[PDB]
């Protein structure tokens, strides 16, 4: 079984014996003392912890060569002219065959971001949205897969005018630095130093204008746990806790041309339960009703207005707010820079093994 042009063979299938490629292995970084981690590698006692999470690495691996898939393949379609609509599902076609989709088990993590711009992220269309990519466009690929829980949280950045080559690689330099940093025992507030540092020390020019890079401060890194985007932990992308073994960190940095901050702006597309709530009784039936249509097909994972229309809902926007003003779902509104800025963004999903730092996410192209 080998992958079709396009792909529409799930990761399984091309891998029957359930054993999915690695991503990139590390060592960890150098201690405080300035001693070696490299101990970690060779531990009898930490092969054996590492071993005995096989199955779990299994599932972020599979997620991640969906995603790698999935990526290579809107990569070499994605042009100025279509929708935003056209993109976002022609992406998730793909990406819910590949994941071989199976309600809470296998699917989507969360919705396609593809926020443009002065946006810098959770802008994916609602239905009737007009928007076209242009050929001055800066557009975050941000998408999710999962197996079991386990998610892979990866973007990049496309562009098509060359004149953000160098934000681009500012920001691509500063989520790799973040990773390098990343490690067991590592305070979260310096790898959060260690990328802006890198961020800020690359200026660009965009149409006669010169900016030095800026980290956006209010956007961050994160932990993720099993079906938990963000499982509590933050990694700042400015200057200012520990990372510790087994967890598994979303490594996301945002660099912009604007003020380094964003505001709530434009409609609502993503939205998601609170993970800390548990039984709500509802009586008022719409409300009722797309409470166990979320529960039922997306748990705590997050979800978009175009994911409940594709499962035939109509007339539930006020069921919605229903359900955020009584602190059951979370809206989480597009994230903005000021009018006329550039954002990029670059995020893998990395492993803390006991053995070795996995970037479970890497690809031959970022
Ligand atoms: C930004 C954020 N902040 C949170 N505070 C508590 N839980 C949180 C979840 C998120 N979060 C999301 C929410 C909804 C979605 F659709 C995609 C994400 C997402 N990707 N990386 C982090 C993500
Ligand atoms: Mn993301
Ligand atoms: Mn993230």
């Given amino acids: 079984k080998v992958q079709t042009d396009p792909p529409s063979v799930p990761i399984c299938d091309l891998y029957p014996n359930g054993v999915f490629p690695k991503g990139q292995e590390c060592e960890y970084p150098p201690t405080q003392d300035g001693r070696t981690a490299a101990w970690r590698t060779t531990s009898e006692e930490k092969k054996a912890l590492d071993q005995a999470s096989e199955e779990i690495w299994n599932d972020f691996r599979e997620a991640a060569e969906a995603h790698r898939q999935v990526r290579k393949y809107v990569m070499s379609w994605i042009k100025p002219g279509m929708t935003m609509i056209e993109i976002c599902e022609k992406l998730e076609d793909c990406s819910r065959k590949l994941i071989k989709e199976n309600g809470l088990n296998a699917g989507l993590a969360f919705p396609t971001g593809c926020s443009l711009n002065n946006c810098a992220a959770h802008y994916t269309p ?31 950045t496309v562009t098509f005018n060359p004149k953000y080559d160098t934000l681009l690689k500012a920001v691509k330099d500063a989520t790799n630095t973040g990773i390098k940093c990343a490690g067991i ?11 802006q540092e890198v961020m800020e020390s690359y200026e660009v020019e965009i149409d006669g204008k010169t900016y030095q890079v800026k980290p956006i401060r209010n956007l961050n890194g994160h932990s993720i746990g099993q079906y938990r985007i963000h499982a509590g932990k933050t990694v ?27 505001h709530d702006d434009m409609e609502c597309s993503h939205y998601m339960k609170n993970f800390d709530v548990g039984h709500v009784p509802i009586r008022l039936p719409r409300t009722k009703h797309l409470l166990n249509v979320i529960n039922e097909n997306f748990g705590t994972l997050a979800f978009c207005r175009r994911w409940l229309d594709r499962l035939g809902e109509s007339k539930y926007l006020m069921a919605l707010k229903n359900l955020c003003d009584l602190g059951i779902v979370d809206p989480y509104p597009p994230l903005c820079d000021i009018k006329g800025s550039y954002t990029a963004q670059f995020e893998h999903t990395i492993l803390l093994r006991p053995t070795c730092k996995e970037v479970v996410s890497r690809g031959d192209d970022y």
């Fill in 126 to 156: 609602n239905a009737g949205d007009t928007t076209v990519l242009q050929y001055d466009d800066i557009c975050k690929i941000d998408f999710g897969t999962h197996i079991s829980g386990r998610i892979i949280d990866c973007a990049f």
């Fill in 185 to 195: 025992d590592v305070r979260l507030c310096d790898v959060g130093e260690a990328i």
């Fill in 236 to 262: 700042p992308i400015v200057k200012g806790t520990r990372m510790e073994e087994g967890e598994v960190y979303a490594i996301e940095t945002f660099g912009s041309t604007g003020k380094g901050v964003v």
